[PDB]
């Protein structure tokens, strides 16, 4: 049942921009999200001081997917463990305890990809979190589909738009509610020529060209959230990327870089079945 949203697909209602995404298959400058539009969205929350750490996604009732750098980044003396954090699923508002809508979960075990490269370029920026007990789904809480080789193959193409969401910075004010932006995937060439960081195959970049006129990007606080695409074949939402890194937020000539979830699916399978 992944990727079919209780309030949209299941009732045959389209959200207000998904057609831009479907028309293309030939947060800075985003908008406020509608209620129930990304029910897989998770907030990673620090207990003391109480604060937004990162975004994340619900992929099953037991498991959350996030960027490894949200948990361990030794340059900034960041190394969190299970009891440091709380996962808050079902939210829309950044700061309010949305009583009776959201669920807060405690973590059982964090798994960071063993070859996560924090030293040089955040290569394999991916971590899994097994929750203490299952979250029950609802109108506001529903998992996203992880892609298969064939959905990865036909959708992750230059020009095809995807959608990024998060409660991070609006500029390089944090928002009141969840923001959303739809960004085109960019050709690896262009991606490599915009930066000095060595790009690897476990990454892709998204954003409009300086001449395309539209603009938008992820920014600080958005890390760990989902880049998702809707399949035109079975109508579900698949998560293709994890918000990883950028050089500022929405600079011209620069693009955001995302962990390629399909390229690391084997490590994700291996951890889920060997641990629950």
């Amino acid at each position: 049942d992944c990727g079919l949203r209780p309030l949209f697909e299941k009732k045959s209602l389209e959200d207000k921009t998904e057609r831009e995404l479907l028309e293309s298959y030939i947060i800075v400058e985003g908008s406020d999200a509608e209620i129930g539009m990304s029910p897989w969205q998770v907030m990673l929350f620090r207990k003391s001081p109480q604060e937004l750490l990162c975004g994340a996604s619900l992929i099953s009732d037991r498991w959350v997917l996030t960027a490894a750098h949200c948990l361990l980044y030794p340059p900034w003396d960041k190394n969190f463990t299970e009891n440091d954090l709380l996962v808050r699923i079902g939210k829309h508002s950044r700061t309010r305890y949305e009583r009776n809508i959201e669920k807060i979960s405690m973590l059982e075990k964090i798994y960071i990809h063993p070859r996560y490269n924090w030293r040089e370029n955040l290569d394999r920026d991916i971590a899994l979190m097994k929750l203490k007990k299952p979250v029950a789904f609802s109108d506001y809480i529903h998992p996203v589909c992880l892609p298969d080789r064939e959905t990865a193959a036909s959708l992750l193409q230059a020009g095809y738009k995807g959608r990024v969401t998060g409660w991070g910075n609006l500029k390089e004010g944090q928002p009141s509610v969840l923001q959303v932006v739809n960004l085109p995937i960019v050709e690896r060439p262009v991606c490599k020529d915009s930066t000095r960081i060595r790009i690897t195959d476990n990454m892709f970049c998204a954003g409009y060209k300086p001449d395309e006129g539209k603009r938008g990007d992820a920014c600080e606080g958005d890390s760990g959230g989902p880049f998702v695409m809707k399949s035109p074949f079975n109508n579900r939402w698949y998560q293709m990327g994890i918000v990883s890194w950028g050089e500022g937020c929405d600079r011209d000539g620069k693009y955001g870089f995302y962990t390629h979830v399909f390229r690391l699916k084997k490590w994700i399978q291996k951890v889920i079945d060997q641990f629950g």
């Binding site: 929350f45 207990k47 109480q50 604060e51 709380l86 305890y97 807060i104 405690m106």
Partner: peptide
């Protein structure tokens, strides 16, 4: 500016 979450969770 986070609103105080229930202590039950913080325990």
């Amino acid at each position: 500016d986070f609103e105080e979450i229930p202590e039950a969770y913080l325990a």
